[PDB]
Design a binder for this molecule. Sequence first.
Ligand SMILES: C[C@H](CCC(=O)NCC(=O)O)[C@H]1CC[C@H]2[C@@H]3[C@H](O)C[C@@H]4C[C@H](O)CC[C@]4(C)[C@H]3C[C@H](O)[C@]12C
Length: 127
Amino acid sequence: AFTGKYEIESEKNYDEFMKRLALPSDAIDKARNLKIISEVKQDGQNFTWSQQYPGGHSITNTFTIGKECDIETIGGKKFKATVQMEGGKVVVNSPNYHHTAEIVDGKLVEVSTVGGVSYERVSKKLA
Ligand SMILES: C[C@H](CCC(=O)NCC(=O)O)[C@H]1CC[C@H]2[C@@H]3[C@H](O)C[C@@H]4C[C@H](O)CC[C@]4(C)[C@H]3C[C@H](O)[C@]12C
C-alpha cells in the first residue's frame, strides 16, 4: 500500500476493453487466463508501475502524480495523460479514458473506464 509485487486476484472485462483500446490479436490471446503480476515500485510522488505478463510480453510505466505524463506504444498512439491522486486512490485520466487505482484488504483494485466499457481488476499483494 501502494508499493509491492502484486499478483492478479481476478479480472472480468479485459477482452472487450482491448477492442476499445485498439490492441492486437497478439495481446488478446496471450492474456487468456494468465496470472498477470502488477509490480509497483513507488519512487515518491513518482512511480514505476509494471503489468508483467508470463506470455512473452510485459508493460512497464514510469509516471508522476500531480502532472501530465507522456504515453506511447499501447495501440500505436502518442498520447499525453493527466496523472493524479483521487481521494485515497491513484488515477490516470486522458481523452476518452479514466483509470482509478484504489486500495482494499492490502490489495489493489483498479477500475478502467473507456468509450462504452469499464474494466475492473483486483490485484492481491502476497509477496
Ligand atoms: C493511456 C493509455 C490509453 C490511451 C488510449 O488509447 N485511449 C483511447 C482509447 O482507449 O481508444 C492506457 C491504456 C492502458 C494503460 C496501462 C494499463 O492500464 C496498465 C497499467 C495500469 C497502471 O494503473 C498505470 C500504468 C499502466 C501501464 C497503464 C498506462 C496507461 O494508462 C495505458 C497505456
